[PDB]
Write a protein that binds this DNA or RNA. Structure first.
Lengths: 44, 45, 45, 44
DNA sequence: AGTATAACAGTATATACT
DNA sequence: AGTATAACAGTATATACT
């Protein structure tokens, strides 16, 4: 299976996370989100 | 502004992540990921 | 069906609860309370 | 100050929590929610 | 696979009766 | 104070280009 999910982050609501996603080299985005999750999980 | 990005996590390749998103309380997916990144980010630079 | 109930927690009477709800991630209030009760409930009967 | 919040629980989505709120004697509802929170908090 | 874009409960408030 | 009721991002999907 697969879990699809559309995430939206907002300019004024969360700037830094916004800037982050917007400058990550295209082709690595999912990789990160995935990583950020990988840790966020153990780190729980 | 808004960044839209749809991600797909495949059951097989990364079970734990899949399993996670798939079983988080209703209406927490965006919150969680949003949290995960927040922490990830500064953890880096 | 649906149960609607609006609660009000006063800063003074129960600071900690107030402070909590007031600083939980966006779109998690219903989830959290929903969680709190879930646990509360069976903890009882 | 005060924090107001309208919570809605659904029949088919979460039955037990639904039944609970629906049978608690009227005048004690907030008291509980508040209690459930009181613990949910320390218990964190 | 990663990415770019394109229709149906929480959140916030308010009035009013016990 | 507790309670009863009354308008504006997440969630889910899909198509399509690299």
């Amino acid at each position: 299976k697969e879990t699809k999910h559309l995430l939206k982050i907002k300019k004024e609501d969360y700037p830094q996370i916004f800037d982050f996603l917007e400058n990550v080299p295209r082709g690595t985005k999912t990789a990160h989100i995935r990583e950020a999750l990988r840790r966020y999980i153990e780190e729980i």
